[PDB]
Each structure stands twice: as structure tokens, then as C-alpha cells.
Amino acid sequence: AEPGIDKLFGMVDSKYRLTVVVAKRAQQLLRHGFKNTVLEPEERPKMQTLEGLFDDPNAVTWAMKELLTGRLVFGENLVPEDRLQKEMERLYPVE
Amino acid sequence: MEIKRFGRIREVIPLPPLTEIQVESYRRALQADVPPEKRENVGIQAAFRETFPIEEEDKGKGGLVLDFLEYRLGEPPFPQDECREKDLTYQAPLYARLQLIHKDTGLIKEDEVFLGHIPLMTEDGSFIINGADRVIVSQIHRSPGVYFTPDPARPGRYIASIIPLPKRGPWIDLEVEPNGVVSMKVNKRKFPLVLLLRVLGYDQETLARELGAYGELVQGLMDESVFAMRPEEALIRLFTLLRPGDPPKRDKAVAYVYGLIADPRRYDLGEAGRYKAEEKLGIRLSGRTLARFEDGEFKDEVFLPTLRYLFALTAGVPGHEVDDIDHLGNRRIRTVGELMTDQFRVGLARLARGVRERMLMGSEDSLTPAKLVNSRPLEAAIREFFSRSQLSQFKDETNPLSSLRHKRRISALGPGGLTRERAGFDVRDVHRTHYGRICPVETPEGANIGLITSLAAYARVDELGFIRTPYRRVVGGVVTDEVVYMTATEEDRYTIAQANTPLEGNRIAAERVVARRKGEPVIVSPEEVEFMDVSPKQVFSVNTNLIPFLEHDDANRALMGSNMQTQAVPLIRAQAPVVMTGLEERVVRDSLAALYAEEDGEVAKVDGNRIVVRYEDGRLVEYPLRRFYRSNQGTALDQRPRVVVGQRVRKGDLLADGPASENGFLALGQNVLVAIMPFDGYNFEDAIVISEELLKRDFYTSIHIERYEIEARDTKLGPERITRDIPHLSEAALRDLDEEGVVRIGAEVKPGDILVGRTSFKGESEPTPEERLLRSIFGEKARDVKDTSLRVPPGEGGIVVRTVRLRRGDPGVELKPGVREVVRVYVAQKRKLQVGDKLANRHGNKGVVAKILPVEDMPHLPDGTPVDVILNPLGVPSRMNLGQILETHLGLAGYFLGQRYISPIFDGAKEPEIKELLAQAFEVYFGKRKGEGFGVDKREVEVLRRAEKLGLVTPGKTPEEQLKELFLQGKVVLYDGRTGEPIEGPIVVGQMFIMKLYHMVEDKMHARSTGPYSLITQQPLGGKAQFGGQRFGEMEVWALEAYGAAHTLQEMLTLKSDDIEGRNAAYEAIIKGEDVPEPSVPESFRVLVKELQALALDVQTLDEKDNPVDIFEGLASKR
DNA sequence: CCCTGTCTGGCGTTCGCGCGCCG
RNA sequence: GAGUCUGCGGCGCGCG
DNA sequence: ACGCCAGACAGGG
């Protein structure tokens, strides 16, 4: 199946919430630039025509791989709706 | 190879021409082959005299007398193939002689009037309506008589029913409800049953005492005494009961219609209807149906006997008057003829309608020709029946057998007048009398079922649609070789016995032997055995009789077997079954697959296109062979010569084989060695395996030809030209298009190549301001014309074999309007048995190919011979069809004994006899092995150990003797092939006949990205080259709904199907690798809203606070 | 005028796909 | 800097 | 054809 899906399922209060989180995460992953990640260095996402998955294969595949770690934070109202998209474009470069 | 046929029941008569019902029916239908002198005047001629003497007397001036002389039809406009090449309708011209009389001195005879072009029948039994061969399927229904059936809801007493066909013509019912009324219904509202008796002449006194001496129901008849005291007046009183507001005075006018000529029937005087009378109810009939017009005073020997048996059915046992509808001695079968004659007479009425109007239009006497006749009605009438009647379909010619079956399957649905579709649990069931008259299995599985079922083996329609079945006579304890095709009614009067009865010749052999009185199993004595069945085959249909051991297969699973055959695709290599039934020969021959020699003679020339034989009578004929023709279903039909140059030929010997015949034998699929064991997961429960070796030799290969066609339309924008000129990009794509415009023959066309080039105009009416700047920049002078060329649609193409082009000066073709010229492009391709395909044996095991294993490692026998296919065992326990396991055992024998066999239906081969042949095969198997130099394997002995420990071989006997014992069981030892290790435990193997099923365009898969959309609904749709989207159905909706698949559900309803703006942005986004925008309103809702707005209702969307919101972005606001 | 009963009037009746025909 | 127009209603049969 | 629901009107106090 998929990497630690049960680990992931236990991390959220409701099944369908994890789904929304991963999805919204995959969205930002692409929009503000694909380098908006929290665990790229040593062991990270990878494909094999070359090791090129390091750049842009599957968005959510990363989101899950990150949420599996304890770096990200998902809440009902964590950071004010509009101020987030502003600070995010200010710090992340790829366009 | 040798042939041994086991079952011995003396087949007293041959199977009737399978095509006999269609051929002969249409023969008697249109008696045109013999002069009008010849007496058989039914059908054409009958319908003619039925409406030819047009009598129109007074309303101004009349005394009109137009009468029929002789009907003659004879020179076909064009020929068969010409009618398939060109879209034509193969119909002969008919014009009979006609002469109109006058009340004044003069009788003008305008000899011919070609009104109506009626289709002809091909030598085989099918027609050619328009480009495609069609079939007229027979039908069933209640015949015309009078019967007495039990009352609807009330458990009380039963009611009578008088049934007169044609449609127009009353339908009487006699019911008594004693608190004060009796009910006789013509169209609907009841009056009395006596108000009618009194008109004809039956008074309350005489009527009541004679019909009611035995009963009491007579008290409802004398009830309304007030109307019963006046005779001839009740005639006018009844007329009053009908309701239009008509003249009270009409001497004997409407009493005539339900009297002698029209509504009642002109069915032969004597046995047509009078049969259902004399035996079932009432004794006499004066004049075909209740008919008379000699004194003005009518006679009805039918109206009192119906209520007389109602009084009799409801009171006691004059006999037991309960009629089992379904007894075939009651429901009749409508042959083609009848069905065409009816429409022909419906057209005749339509013509006679308009002609009567012209008897008054014509100034003076010169009014014979055009003044009385107009071909308009007849043409449309007949034409409509053969092109739009719900009964004509595509001839199922997967293999000639298929077509033959499709032709004899019995239907209920039809004119619409007879029986409809959501009414029929009693009709649908297989009645008793359906014996040897209707297959009980041929009923197709699916919604439309039971309503359709091919007839049986020896079944043959006698004179009037009563499928008579053959039954041999047996006088005393003596059985005869004499046979009587009997009516289903007559069958119940006798005590008949089965064919399985032991017989010494004419002598019955057992005192207590089986017989069936009337649909009831009965143990009768040889002395009472009045009649015996003819043979086991008659019980079933042609298509079913082709099943090996049909006796060991479950009726339901056998059905599939019969159906599967109808879907057998013609393989280049046609091989008859290793085990046949006995009708394979008869099939191809009565079907017109193979080409038989007429008379004895010698062969002169053996071409690949023709075999010119020389008969010994001093004559020689050139027999062309349909090289490669396009079947309606797209299968190949080639006649492969099988006779060498200069050869004395026997009368009736195959000179060329039909599309799927090996040697005069029906052949659909081939005989292959098969191991019946389980492999990894390849052969799943229904799924089955295949050996690469089968592809090596083209064992499962078939040919498919397609007829692509394109037309050069005439647009007001400019004629669409056909030319080698394909305006925009390369020469590489114009090679194959050698001939200016057309594609060269023998050219390999792959999907996406130009079959035909055509050039139409760019816009609707205006050029393009943006495309004008593009053209000018690189080269303004650009052929303004757009590229609209016929390309190979995705999927596949093969090599171009034939091409047809019809230009300006048309020979004798019918070019549609606007259509400047057409261009057909036949492409053929070789199809090799692959994974997707599906195969199945005659018994019922159906399955698809899961994996093509290399001969390298599939199961192989002690001797290097490897198995062809591996069938999963599990698919036979739950399913009941051991006949297959029985076919593989005898097949095993045939493999090493090099011989074919013929096991009849119930009488065929038996377990002992097979073990015997197997005993003979062991010597060929193991005997050669002993002499060749070697004995038994470590393997062969190891499997024996586990085998003795199992219970298959008597412990203590020699491996030589044990293997024999084990072989007799139908199983032999096999090595894995992948490890060389044996398969612990003996596994049966054998020669099983397996066929390949027709690959419809439902096989060739569909995957759609983006494409067309519907005009009114904005949902995705395909067709030609763009696949077309899948349906998501609410059931599936629910599926995603169950899951938290929100957006997934949205997507489906928006971005993927209806969101006009959505899909668009969607695409671009993805092209960009962007994140899809957020859904706009779905056109479906929009179209809904407006559709609802069409109706008074106003549906408006609202905001947070009940306030507008706009769905229609901005085109709703006005101006 | 009431309650009960009876015929009466309206709708529904798997799901998707192939092919071929026809105005 | 490509995009129009056709495939509809019904009928028949066949798959699972 | 059937089955089912819902209905509006007519008969017996």
C-alpha cells in the first residue's frame, strides 16, 4: 500500500481531514515554487530514469512524506487566511 | 482418420431443409414462378382478388368494375452483387393485367401498371434490402377460433371469447353476472348476449330450453324481455348501441362485415378455423366464418356454440374445457410470406382508398390508367416493412450456422398488434408443445428472452403455421418407419412413447415402457403405444444439436454453448471438432457455405477464382468462387478450392469449402490438446491459458475486412474535391495515395494514414482576419481550402485491398443529393489470437486468454509433445457440464488412435466403450515407447506412489499395468516443463474442440482524453475517431460519496464533463502543469434551469442572505 | 351529513457497451 | 495565432 | 402487462 498510511491516519482527528491537509499541502508545494519543502537534504523523494524526482514528479507524494515527519502543522485556524499567501511568496523563489 | 458413430436409433427421415420455412413460404407467397393458371392462389394472388374487384355503385354515377386478370412479375432491375456494390434494393418488378368496366358501352383495359417493387429471396434464404442482407424472422400468436377461459378475479364462473382476425373485426366475450345482467362485448360496452341471438333468429323460449335444458345460466339470457319481443328491430337497436350517431336504416350493411367476407377470415374453407371448432366447441360452420348474405336473414352456427360451451364449461364435465394456450395446437407461427402479404394488403387498401376518390374525379370514360392507379401507397407500404419493421435485422453470419439459426428463431414481439414487451410470463415459458417446434434453449439470455427461440431439428411448418413434429406410427406392438407430422392439438389425443424404447425392429421390447399421454409422463404398455417419437434430435434446434454430449451438460450452461456458436469467427485454418454430433455436414450444406457439385463429371480448371468442371453429360460449367467478400458483420467469405485438376467428381461433393469449412464439415475453431489442471493464476475461475505454439502454426487466426466510405459533398461554399492534394504538410503521407486522390491497392495502411483525400472550404461564410495575417507572412497564396480528408481512425487498419469511386457520369448508381461523388476504401488485416480474445467449448466453459506461455515451460507429456491449452478445473464443479470432461477423454483416444468419432445426443458413446478405446490408445502411447527402447521414469513411478496412496491404481500391480489403469481413467503423468519435475498426481488431458468468439468493437478498447461534446447537453460524446466518455452513473457517484472523495466527485461533475469554461481552463492548466482553476457552474445545471424556466417555474440561485447570485455569468441580463 | 369500501387515476419497472439501420 | 461541423429518436440483436 | 400508492366518489346508517 502507501507509506505509513496508518501512521498518518493516527496523526489526524478524522480520516477525511488528512486528505484535505495532504492535498492543500501538495497545492502549495507547486504554487509558491516546488522547493517549499522541509526535508530535502540526505533521504528524500526519488524516481529512477535518473534520480530526478528531486525536482517535480508527484506533489502529494512529498506532502505525505513530510506530514509523516513532525515538521508541518495542520489546524482549523492556525494562521489568518490572507496573510499566509503573502508571507509565503515573500520567502519562497522558484515562480 | 477414421469415424465411429455409437448411438443406434434408426433415424427414419432426414432433417428438413433448415431454410425450408423461409424458402417455401416465400414461394407460395409469390406464386410468380408458375403461370396464373397454376391453382396455388394464396398470398400475392389471394390478396389481389381480395381487394381487386372494386365495387363502387351509387353516389352520383357509378357501376365501377375493375377486375384482376393475371399477375406477372419477372425482370429484375439489377443483380445481387450490383445491389450490394451500389446501394440498391434487389426487387423484382410487378405489373398485373387490369380492365375497368363501364355502365355505358365500353371496357378499357390498360394492361400493365408497374406499381410496387417487391424484394426477392436469395437462393440461401436471405434478402438484400439496402446494401445489407436481411432476414424476416417468423412470429407466434393466438390463432382464430372461440374458447372459454376462467373468470379474471371472481373464483366463480368462466367467460366465453370469440376471436376473429384481421384486427378490424369484433372481439366478442360472454359473461353472466345474475343479480340482473348478462354481458356480451363487441368493442367494449356490454349489451346482451341475447340481443344478438334474437337478431339472427333465436327466441327466448326455444334458445333457453335447448341450450339450458342441462344448465341454469339460461335465466340471464331471457332477462331483458322488453327488447327480446321484437326481432328485426333488435338489428337496428344494436346498431343504435354502437356509437357515432349513425342512420337507423341500413338494411344488412354492417351485419355483413361480421358476417361473410372481410373481418372474419378467408383462411381456407374447412381446416383453417373449422378445425378449432369441430374438436374444441360447436359442430358446424356454414360458410368459412359466421357468414351469409343470401336472404338478408343471417345464420350464425358459431355465436350460440361459444356460450353453449360457456354454459357447459361452467356447469360440469361435457369434457374438461380448460385450454392450455401454450399448447402448440393453439398459438400459431407467422411465416415471412404472411407477414409480407399482410403489409401488401395494407398497401392495397391504401391504394383502393385513393382510387375510389378518382372514380368521381375522372371527367368521362378514359380513366383506366393514371386516373385509378397511384403507386405512391404501395411503395411506401412495402418499403416501410422491409426497412423499418421492428423485425428485420442484420443476418448473424459469424459462421453460416449462426445465420441459419437467426433465421429459425421464433418470436412473439412484432407488428405491435400481437404481443408487446412488458406482458407475457405465460408466453415466455417453454410450453409442452414447443417440442420439436421451438428450441427450449435457443432463447437468448438477456432482457429479450423466451420471446425469441429457434425451432427444432425436424420441425417443419405444415400448411398453416402449426409446427408439426415428426412422430412415427406404431400399430399394436409394431413400430413403423412411416411418419406423421402432427399438429400440436392432435398430439394430445394419442399416447406417444420415446425413442429410447428397446426395439427388435417392429417389436416393442419391454412391457412397462415410457410414453407421454398429454404433457404427462406415463408408464404405458406396448399394446397402448399408439405412436413413438422420431429421434432425440427433433427435441432441440439445429444450433443445439451441434453439442457433443449434450446429455451430460446442464440445460442452462448448454444454452451458452449454442449461443457461443452463433458467435464463432471464421479462422483461415478451419478445423472440424475432434468430436462431433452429426449435423456439421448438414449445416454447411443446407447453409450455402461450400460449393457442391451438381452432377458427376471431371474437373477441367482449378483456379483460385473459379473451378470449371466438366460433367459427363457433355456440359461444362464455370463456378466462380466468392474470392474475398465483406460479410454484413465484417467477416471474410472465401471459397477455397479443394479439388485438384482433372478429377472425377461424385454428385454432391465439395469442390470448394465455405468460409469456415475444413472438408465439407462445419468448422469454427480447432481441436487442440488440452491439459485440465490449474496453473499459477493465469487460468482463473473463468479465465483460461494458451500455448505460444498455437500461434506459431496459424491455429487461431481469422480474417476481418472493413468497408470505409467517403463522399464528395456539394457545399454552397464550394464543391468538395477529391484530389491527391492534401493542402498543408507532407509528401510522406501522399505516397500510398498514388492514384490522383485514391489509395493504391495492396498498400499497407496503418492508423492515421490517408485512405482518401478531399478538400472542402475553411469557414461557414467568412474568411479569417487572424488566419489572414498568418497566411500572408509565410506565403499569402495558400490554398484557402481546409484539409478534410478521410484518415485511418485510431484503432487499426491493414492493407488496402479494394477501392471504389463513383464520379460525375453515374452508370446506374444512386448518388444521394448534394453528394458529388463517393469513395469506398476496403481495408483488410490479419488478426492473430492474443490475450484479449475469448474462446469457448460447445459445452459452456467460456473464458478469455490470460497468458501466452512459451512452449518452453508449459506442461509436457512423457514424450516431448506439449499441451496447447490449460483449463482451470474449478470452473466445472460448481457448473454442471461433465460432457466436456467426457469430450477430453475420448479425444485423448482419438489423438493416439488417429481417428474422429460421432457421439449422438443421448444415444452416443458410453463410459465403457470409451475406456475401451482408451485401452487401444495405451498401446499406441506406451507400446511404441516399449519398442522405441525405454521404460518408466523416476518421475513416472513417483507419481504412481502418490497415485496408489490416492486410490486411482490397485496397489501391488506393475507400473506398466498401473499406468494403463490410470490412463483408462483418462489421466496421464505430466512434467512441469519449467522444472522438469512431474505433477504429483495424474492429470487428464485430451483433444478438446475449442472455438474463438467474435471480436466485436466492444473488445477493441476505448480510452478518451478530450474530444467532442453534445449539442444540447454539454456532455462528452464520441463515435468515429474520438472514443467518447464513460458514464459515471449514480451508483458510482454514491461510491465516491461514500468515500470522502469530495473534489473527485466535483471533478467528475464539473471539470471532466459539463463545466464548459471549466474543462477549457482545466486543459490549458494541465498543459501548463498548473493547478486547475476552481469549477464554474456546470452547463447541465444551466440547461436545467432554463429548461425549467421554459415551464412557468422560475428558479433562482441565492446569496448568504436570501438575495440573488448568478449562475449565468452575464448573458441573462437584458440587452 | 359521517365512516367505509370500491373502482379509479397516476408512475415505475438495472446498468453500461458493440453494431447496423432509418427519416 | 488553427477550429468547424457532424453523430438524434426509435428499433433489432449480442456481452457480462 | 403488473404492482403500488393515493384518491375521489357512492352507498348504508
Ligand SMILES: Nc1ncnc2c1ncn2[C@@H]1O[C@H](COP(=O)(O)CP(=O)(O)OP(=O)(O)O)[C@@H](O)[C@H]1O
Ligand atoms: N441481467 C443482468 N443484469 C445485470 N447484470 C447481469 C445480468 N446478467 C448477468 N449480469 C452480471 O454479470 C455477472 C455474470 O454472472 P456470473 O459471472 O455468473 C457471476 P457469479 O455470481 O460469480 O456466478 P458464478 O459464481 O457462476 O461465476 C453477474 O455478476 C452480474 O453482475
